[PDB]
Amino acid sequence: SGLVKMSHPSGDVEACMVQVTCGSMTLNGLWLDNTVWCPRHVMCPADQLSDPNYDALLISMTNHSFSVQKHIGAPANLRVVGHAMQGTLLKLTVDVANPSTPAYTFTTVKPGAAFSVLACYNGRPTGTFTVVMRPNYTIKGSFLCGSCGSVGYTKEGSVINFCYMHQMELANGTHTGSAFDGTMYGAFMDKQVHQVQLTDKYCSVNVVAWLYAAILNGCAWFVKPNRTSVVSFNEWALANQFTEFVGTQSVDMLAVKTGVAIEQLLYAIQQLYTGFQGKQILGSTMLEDEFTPEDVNMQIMGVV
Amino acid sequence: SGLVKMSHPSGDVEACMVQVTCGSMTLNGLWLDNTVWCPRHVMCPADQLSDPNYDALLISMTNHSFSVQKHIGAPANLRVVGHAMQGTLLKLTVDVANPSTPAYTFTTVKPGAAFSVLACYNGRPTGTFTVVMRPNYTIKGSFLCGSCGSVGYTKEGSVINFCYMHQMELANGTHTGSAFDGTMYGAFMDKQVHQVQLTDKYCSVNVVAWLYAAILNGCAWFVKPNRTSVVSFNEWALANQFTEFVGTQSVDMLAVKTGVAIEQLLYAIQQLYTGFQGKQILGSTMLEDEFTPEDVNMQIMGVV
Ligand SMILES: CNC(=O)c1cc(Br)cc([N+](=O)[O-])c1N[C@@H]1CCCC[C@@H]1NC(=O)c1cncc2ccccc12
Ligand SMILES: CNC(=O)c1cc(Br)cc([N+](=O)[O-])c1N[C@@H]1CCCC[C@@H]1NC(=O)c1cncc2ccccc12
């Protein structure tokens, strides 16, 4: 029993972190097979940060303009045999294939999904935590200067899903990054300019999962027989800054084990959005959308 | 910037997890050099879980009663060449030394301290999170059946401090375990009998660290010129379920860089235990004691 912010064990990914240095700019990079991914603004000379010409910056570069160093495990310098650009990322071809490359994927997560983040500095991991892709395509992490290139991932089975590479802090505690296809979440730009965010919203499915968690941990004062259809809640959501609810088989698993219908918790959410009246839900006085249905499933009933 | 619950990268400790089997019971064990630490109640069947004779169960034991097996990376069975009991733990000697043994120590943590927990099942790591040793000598983790033997740790430099081995769940979301000297935190007993806990308290030093974090994120509406001595706050604390405050340099480093005195934040705590006046502090309506001064230093200023 118990619900915490839980991240995936990071050894798989610790073995893939390196330091990327270009000119006078250093950051972190992900070393998979014969490739090292890193943010492309490592090439930007710090003063072209307001109007960077990444095409010109790339053609300007040679393969020795980049230095890749591995500080964890067995250290080595890796000779860079190729440099390429993909969206907002640099893909550097190296002469040695990473012997610790795990089975991996590059799939872009949508808002509401969760992934474990491994924060790194100078190619050295410092901490790990779990975040959620906000509806405005940001995350609420903890990053200092030089942490870009740190990677966010999940793992189902033996396969690691690499979904995030840190790039920018927009406001206090607000951050963004890339998918490993090169596209930046929310179409933000890698340039120190004015960047407006969309409005943040509560992730409906995650609140439902969190209420199911509270029930399975002996906290169910908020449950009454009343119900509210999914259409009834999505229309309510379009006016009160909530995401459109979409049922999934994990949410349905939670509903089956609690004997509490999704519609009951949607009604409960409608009632709790005003205020908890001084009561607590799993030690919280607000609705919590930091927990996905899969996360609660694995934490409460386990994936054996 | 930003403050999250951050855990230490776990590869160090993942490389030390094994499965320990004694009869029909299977839990996790920590493999350091030629020794495997595990909870001793792996020896006791449901038959004697209400009044166990651990002294006799050990003299009853042979080296063939125990099976140690390694599931991650390269699987293997390890022969048990010796069995011993130390407090509430079993030390089983094996013929093979763990080749990935890191530099480690065994220290018993005090209330208010935080450590990273690696949750394991059948010797396989599943998740990692951060907990705090509560004033009643429990932790608020996430453990299901088979979680025993999972370990909580910290890291200084190259040295891992092993502080916790999980053993029991007392109530929903409430857990405890033993230190690697063999003693169980809070003197709980490894017998499936009802054990009432002492009263939980707010850990004052950690709330002070969290307020310092808030100030350093441009959030300091709660700061008044008013002061409250540590002696007034401790007298107030013993009557309002707070721990008695004790300063450290870590708090003092925070105090000088914020230009805000500890006593000011103690006054703020006295005022905030009532209610936050509809305000938010780093996005919550509760006081947060999950963050230690060292944690705040490392996350905000990078002083580890
Ligand atoms: C205004 N801070 C922005 O991060 C930023 C904003 C915009 Br708008 C555009 C970019 N951009 O173009 O990459 C930004 N990144 C900076 C530019 C060059 C390379 C990376 C830089 N950022 C960090 O080093 C960094 C990462 N995480 C947390 C931090 C906390 C404090 C200080 C720095 C960071
Ligand atoms: C549930 N009850 C107790 O855990 C318990 C309670 C007391 Br009082 C004493 C012991 N004791 O003496 O070991 C206990 N451990 C059980 C006894 C035999 C071996 C381990 C057993 N526990 C787990 O498997 C376990 C661990 N963590 C979280 C869990 C969540 C749900 C279910 C089980 C767990």
Residue numbers in the entry:
A (entry chain B), B (entry chain A): 1 to 304
From the paper:
The 3C-like protease (3CLpro) is an essential enzyme for the replication of SARS-CoV-2 and other coronaviruses and thus is a target for coronavirus drug discovery. The multidomain protein nsp3 contains a papain-like protease (PLpro) domain and cleaves the peptide bonds to release nsp1, nsp2, and nsp3.3,4 3CLpro cleaves peptide bonds to release nsp4 to nsp16.3 After releasing itself from pp1a or pp1ab, 3CLpro forms a homodimer with increased protease activity. Here, we report the development of specific, noncovalent inhibitors of 3CLpro.
The 3CLpro of MERS-CoV shares only 50% sequence identity with SARS-CoV-2 3CLpro. Even so, WU-04 inhibited MERS-CoV 3CLpro with an IC50 of about 1 μM. The crystal structure of the MERS-CoV 3CLpro/WU-04 complex was also determined using molecular replacement and refined to 2.98 Å resolution. The binding mode of WU-04 in this structure was very similar to that in the structure of the SARS-CoV-2 3CLpro/WU-04 complex. The anti-MERS-CoV activity of WU-04 was confirmed in Calu-3 cells and in Vero E6 cells, giving the EC50 values of around 53 nM and 609 nM, respectively. Alignment of the 3CLpro sequence of SARS-CoV-2 with those of SARS-CoV, MERS-CoV, and the other four human coronaviruses shows that most key residues in direct contact with WU-04 are conserved; in addition, most other residues within 5 Å of WU-04 in the SARS-CoV-2 3CLpro structure are also conserved.
